[PDB]
Design a protein around this ligand. Structure first.
Ligand SMILES: O=C(O)c1cnc2ccccc2c1O
Length: 438
């Protein structure tokens, strides 16, 4: 496959559903390269667990943890890492309230080159155990010979765009990694980088991040087809922010408008949102504790009951993962019969203004609170007009894209409710025999 899109291993499915999945131990294995140094961008860390995932012979190589924690949380993280002399930390600045550092990325510097991994999992045991998570693996990028002058750039501008993303941190430990990236040839990259960084962007910077970045890429590198208004938009996520009192405030005005862009020319497009129901969580491999990682609060939800009429159940028979709750986030544009897609995005970004940005100042400024990162698969980047949807995720056709959940998505039933993490569920017990009492 050209796509290099993987799911994480799930404990408890049959081996045919883990063949071609990756555990973190597989990613860090010496088979992938001889590690010299690594950077782990993430949100939540279990440092003891993390060091155990590196091969024994690599466990004292330098590791940089890039995080967003402040005050006592920051103290706790430093305390976790102090036993390990080879671990340094970088606190990403979060100068806008209610922002977080959500980006999940590994930079892996080898003897043989450089690899970039953009994924959706926290660096804790439970995120790699029984959840549906996504991984994009870069090629092995070779070093550019000392004295050679070449750009090392791809047709998707990935090298410049990744450096731009790192420059936004304004951090000395990441200037070191920027210089590493400058020294390597990333020209084989066939995905586009879509990042969010905190700030207020106007003018020439408006298109750099968030949903305006997506819109710009779709305008420039995708084509509109006849009956484009019939091609749905699908969003699939593990948390929802406060989106406003009705759909016109943000979801179906600026967000959907960005996601329905195709081509350069100037809505009733169906919008499917996939988010686990209470019954999805109850009957999951983890049971109700899976809801610990689906943090939709009742305070937020009761302000926007209009939203839930868009919600569809989690179902993933195609990858044997209907009972492995999603922490992956994906967005895509299928054809009306769900047999093709015009593009696919895997990202850390949930369905929130904090992650995707919200227009301010009379439409002239895009304000983003958080760090997020994902990669966009466009048919043009692969010499194609569209992607065929792979019928079984782990089956085997070569330019068919592996969509990890079932299509068409299934609407909530009248008795279903969206998983809301801070109210009790005591009517029916979960797969481990327990109720949920927050
Ligand atoms: O990975 C993330 O982006 C993230 C961020 N905040 C979270 C808050 C509660 C539970 C899970 C969370 C999570 O999984």
């Amino acid at each position: 496959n050209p796509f290099q899109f993987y799911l994480t291993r799930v404990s408890g499915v049959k081996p045919k559903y883990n063949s071609g999945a990756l555990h973190i131990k597989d990613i860090l294995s010496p088979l992938f390269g001889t590690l010299v140094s690594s950077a782990q961008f993430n949100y939540c860390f279990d440092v003891d667990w993390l060091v155990k995932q590196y091969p024994p012979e690599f466990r004292k190589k330098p590791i940089l943890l890039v995080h967003g924690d402040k005050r006592e949380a920051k103290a706790h993280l430093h305390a976790q890492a102090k036993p390990y002399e080879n671990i340094s930390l970088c606190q990403a600045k979060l100068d806008i309230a209610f922002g977080t550092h959500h980006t999940k990325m590994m930079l892996l510097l080898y003897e043989e080159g450089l690899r970039v991994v953009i994924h959706t999992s926290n660096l804790i045991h439970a995120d790699w155990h029984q959840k549906t998570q996504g991984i994009w693996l870069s090629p092995l990028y070779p070093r550019i010979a000392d004295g050679t002058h070449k750009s090392g750039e791809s047709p998707t501008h990935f090298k410049a765009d990744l450096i731009s993303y790192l420059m936004a941190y304004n951090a000395p430990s990441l200037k070191e990694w920027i210089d590493v990236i400058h020294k390597h040839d990333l020209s084989e990259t066939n995905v586009y980088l879509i990042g969010s960084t905190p700030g207020r962007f106007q003018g020439s910077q408006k298109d750099n991040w968030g949903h305006f970045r997506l819109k710009k890429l779709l305008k420039d590198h995708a084509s509109s087809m006849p009956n484009a208004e019939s091609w749905p938009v699908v969003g699939q996520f593990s948390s929802v922010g406060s989106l406003g009192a009705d759909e016109s405030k943000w979801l179906c005005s600026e967000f959907k408008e960005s996601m329905l862009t195709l081509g350069k020319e100037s809505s009733s497009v169906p919008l499917y949102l996939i988010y686990p129901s209470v019954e999805n969580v109850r009957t999951s491999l983890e049971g109700y504790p899976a809801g610990g990682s689906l943090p939709y609060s009742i305070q937020t939800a009761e302000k926007q009951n209009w939203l839930h009429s868009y919600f569809h159940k989690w179902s993933a028979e195609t990858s044997g993962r209907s009972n492995a709750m999603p922490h992956i986030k994906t967005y895509m544009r299928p054809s009306p019969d769900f047999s093709k897609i015009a593009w696919f995005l895997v990202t850390s970004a949930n369905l929130s203004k904090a992650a995707w940005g919200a227009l301010e100042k009379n439409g002239t400024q895009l304000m983003i609170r958080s760090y997020e990162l994902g990669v966009l698969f466009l048919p043009s980047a692969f010499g194609l007009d569209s992607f065929k949807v792979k019928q079984k995720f782990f089956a085997g056709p070569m330019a068919t894209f592996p969509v990890p959940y079932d299509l068409p998505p299934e609407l909530y039933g009248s008795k279903d409710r969206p998983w809301i993490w801070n109210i009790p569920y005591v009517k029916a017990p979960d797969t481990h025999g327990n109720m949920w009492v927050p």
